[PDB]
Design a protein around this ligand. Structure first.
Ligand SMILES: Cc1cc2nc3c(=O)[nH]c(=O)nc-3n(C[C@H](O)[C@H](O)[C@H](O)COP(=O)(O)OP(=O)(O)OC[C@H]3O[C@@H](n4cnc5c(N)ncnc54)[C@H](O)[C@@H]3O)c2cc1C
Ligand SMILES: Cc1cc2nc3c(=O)[nH]c(=O)nc-3n(C[C@H](O)[C@H](O)[C@H](O)COP(=O)(O)OP(=O)(O)OC[C@H]3O[C@@H](n4cnc5c(N)ncnc54)[C@H](O)[C@@H]3O)c2cc1C
Ligand SMILES: NC(=O)c1cc(N2CC2)c([N+](=O)[O-])cc1[N+](=O)[O-]
Ligand SMILES: NC(=O)c1cc(N2CC2)c([N+](=O)[O-])cc1[N+](=O)[O-]
Ligand SMILES: [Zn+2]
Ligand SMILES: [Zn+2]
Lengths: 230, 230
């Protein structure tokens, strides 16, 4: 039996360092025999805004619009917009979701935030109850592959930015773990715009090399202690 | 004399609890004689995606698009899209910026993420050097007014979600502090949807009351210790 991978990719420029890391992931996972799909959010002009257009059916309560409630129900009625349900198919079938993005404001670019907000709806990714370790995507793996402007030392506890692990918490725990994913350790490629040609090559090579044995890695313990120390 | 307030507001439904919190803020700050402006993102259909459309006319390097470089240059050359510069004008003039939003995945809704992404460009909100306490918005105050689905107990260190301060980091430190704002203590309105109508009313009264003395408040210390201590 093989493995299915979805790469959710958020960068405007094919020739960027992010583009290189995404292409390398496709090549290496494809070479392994994996089933691979890429959602290139900017080329898709993916809609990030959570709005009433996300539901192609009778809006249940059209007097007071509640996005959570309307999308939950629309999920059950199979009446979500097709951009959403197309992504949900991709996610439903994946054994591994990789997110490839440059860090914007200690988080994901908005187009990618919008993918999280609209795709990962109640009924689909979680239920109440049915989250964290009972999240509806248990059994899947997830991996953040992030590039920064800041260097590694800036992202240490004694540095100006604090530990890079600090900003991971809403993504790794708040989102991914919440939906039931097991989380592989993040790939962080620090400061590529500042690095030499060779350092950049080494970072891209370190990532393809990691992907070779990706199916053998254990998930991190996705806890407050992993992220915060103490 | 006076002060000016910008409320950056991210909720699709005026009749929502978020809508009431926004309306009470406008009411009360207004009554005080403040100048008040609301950027109602969803009603503006505000563009969240960071794209080459954000630069007017001809790019500095159209072969390889770098969003950061291009927006930094367009800022100096006064060629940023008018939707961005319209917001920058509001922020420039503000003494206090209030963010009013529902928590979406331990962060801001994507439409508001894209506000941050596209509005707070280099040259305007920060430079290098010129960030953290030297950020270019220094002397300004910022405050997150956030509503949750989860209860206050869920957002303790021993609750399922972890302390609320953990998720504030990318916003308060990574973004607001980084641009030089001083950050007032967040206003967190826990689980309104679950509350009685009377409880909801009490939380709107509490927000109004706090705003009566907002100008008397001191900033939090925006450190890793505040967020992850103790
Ligand atoms: C809105 C905004 C907010 C930001 N917020 C933050 C923040 O909170 N924290 C932070 O740390 N940073 C922040 N940044 C910076 C951003 O994270 C970095 O600029 C980004 O991660 C760099 O990735 P890139 O793919 O765009 O690099 P690129 O600019 O594309 O370039 C890296 C270099 O490597 C070259 N390259 C491409 N492919 C290869 C390859 N295969 N082999 C060798 N070289 C290659 C490229 O041509 C280029 O010269 C922010 C930037 C923006 C625009
Ligand atoms: C995509 C997505 C991701 C989410 N992620 C998270 C997460 O990470 N963590 C989390 O905790 N939550 C999360 N949530 C939940 C979200 O934070 C809450 O649903 C939201 O904060 C509730 O605020 P509201 O304004 O929308 O409530 P409302 O639905 O508007 O409900 C409150 C009630 O108050 C009523 N009301 C309005 N004004 C008044 C007034 N003046 N007096 C009395 N009653 C009034 C309204 O009629 C309504 O019935 C997420 C939701 C979505 C859709
Ligand atoms: N590496 C950095 O010094 C850096 C660079 C940028 N810049 C160039 C886009 C941003 N940022 O925009 O938020 C933030 C940081 N930071 O470390 O927090
Ligand atoms: N009150 C909650 O239990 C709750 C509800 C939602 N809901 C309404 C969509 C989300 N969330 O979306 O991630 C998160 C939580 N949470 O505590 O982490
Ligand atoms: Zn976790
Ligand atoms: Zn800080």
């Amino acid at each position: 039996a093989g493995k299915k991978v979805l790469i959710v990719y958020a960068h405007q420029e094919p020739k960027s360092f992010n583009g290189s890391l995404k292409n390398v992931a496709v090549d290496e996972l494809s070479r392994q025999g994996c089933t691979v799909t890429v959602s290139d959010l900017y080329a898709m002009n993916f809609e990030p805004r959570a709005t009433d257009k996300d539901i192609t059916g009778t809006l249940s309560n059209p007097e007071v619009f509640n996005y959570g409630v309307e999308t939950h129900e629309a999920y059950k009625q199979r009446s979500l917009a097709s951009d959403i349900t197309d992504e949900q198919k991709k996610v439903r079938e994946a054994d591994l979701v990789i997110f490839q993005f440059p860090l914007y404001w200690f988080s994901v670019p908005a187009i990618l935030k919008g993918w999280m907000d609209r795709v990962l709806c109640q009924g689909f990714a979680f239920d109440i109850p049915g989250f964290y370790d009972s999240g509806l995507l248990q059994g899947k793996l997830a991996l953040l592959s992030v590039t920064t402007g800041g260097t590694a030392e800036m992202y240490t506890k004694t540095g100006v930015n604090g530990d890079s692990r600090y900003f991971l918490w809403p993504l790794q725990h708040g989102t991914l773990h919440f939906c039931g994913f097991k989380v592989l350790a993040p790939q962080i490629s620090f400061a590529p715009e500042i690095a030499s040609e060779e350092e950049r090559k080494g970072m891209v090579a370190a990532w393809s090399q990691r992907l070779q044995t990706i199916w053998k890695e254990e998930p991190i313990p996705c806890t407050a202690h992993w992220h915060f120390g103490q």
